[PDB]
Structures are given as C-alpha cells and as structure tokens.
C-alpha cells in the first residue's frame, strides 16, 4: 500500500499553491486528495511549503506530539498553511469546510530512513 511518507503527503502538502485562492479550497482539497470518501474527516491542514522544506522540519526543534510520541519536530519559522474545519450540515460525502489561511509553525511527526515526515500533529 501507500507508504506512510506518501500518505502525509496526499493528506497534508499543497506545495503547488502559494495559499488558498477562495472560500472553496478546503471543500475542493478535501474531495480531491481523497479525505471525504468514508467519513468527513473533521479536522485538516495542507501546508504550501516546498516538500523539502517541510522535510527539513525533521531536524528541526525536537517536541512530544500531542499523544505523548517523542518524535515530533516544530519548525522554526511559520508556514503558510490551510486548516480545514468540517462544519454542522454535511453527512458524507457531502460533506463542507470552513477553510483559513494562515503562517503559523507546524508540528509534525518523523521517523524511517529516509526520516521524514508520517504525520501532521498541529500548527503553533
């Protein structure tokens, strides 16, 4: 199957973009990267940031993941992201985003060799 770097990038990266251009971003992502099939997924963040600047993160300031996981890296300086928030309504797959644009320091989970990212844990 999909390897657990491949699967962190189809549900979190967007380095062909700059930002969102509309209101309509999460709702189109969310559908497109595959996120919505089974349920809406209620929470997630795509970051508009090369991949090897998000790879970089894995050397970057070592922190516990939200869980309690030792390997979580926080990036130094802020990124350009996108949250999508999964509103009411909505019952998949119909479901709908709230999206925000933002700059703010992401933190995600490393691990493998290569060490690379396998999820995204939060924004700061």
Same mark, same amino acid.
């Given at each position: $199957?999909?390897?657990?770097?491949? $699967? *962190?990038?189809?549900?979190?990266?967007?380095?062909?973009?700059?930002?969102?251009?509309?209101?309509? +971003?999460?709702?189109?992502?969310? #559908?497109?990267?595959?996120?919505? $099939?089974?349920?809406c $997924?209620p929470?997630?963040? *795509?970051?508009?940031?090369?991949?090897?600047?998000?790879?970089?993160?894995?050397?970057? #300031? !070592?922190?516990?993941?939200?869980? @309690?996981?030792?390997?979580? +890296?926080?990036? +130094?300086?802020?990124?350009?992201?996108?949250?999508?928030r999964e509103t009411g309504s909505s #019952?998949?797959?119909?479901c709908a985003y709230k999206?925000?644009?933002? !700059? #703010?320091?992401?933190?995600?989970?490393?691990? @493998?060799?290569? +060490?690379?990212?396998?999820? *995204?844990?939060?924004?700061?």
């Amino acid at each position: $199957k999909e390897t657990a770097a491949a $699967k *962190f990038e189809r549900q979190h990266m967007d380095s062909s973009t700059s930002a969102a251009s509309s209101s309509n +971003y999460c709702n189109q992502m969310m #559908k497109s990267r595959n996120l919505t $099939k089974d349920r809406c $997924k209620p929470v997630n963040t *795509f970051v508009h940031e090369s991949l090897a600047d998000v790879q970089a993160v894995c050397s970057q #300031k !070592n922190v516990a993941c939200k869980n @309690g996981q030792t390997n979580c +890296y926080q990036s +130094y300086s802020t990124m350009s992201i996108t949250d999508c928030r999964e509103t009411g309504s909505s #019952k998949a797959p119909n479901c709908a985003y709230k999206t925000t644009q933002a !700059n #703010k320091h992401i933190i995600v989970a490393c691990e @493998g060799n290569p +060490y690379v990212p396998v999820h *995204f844990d939060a924004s700061v």
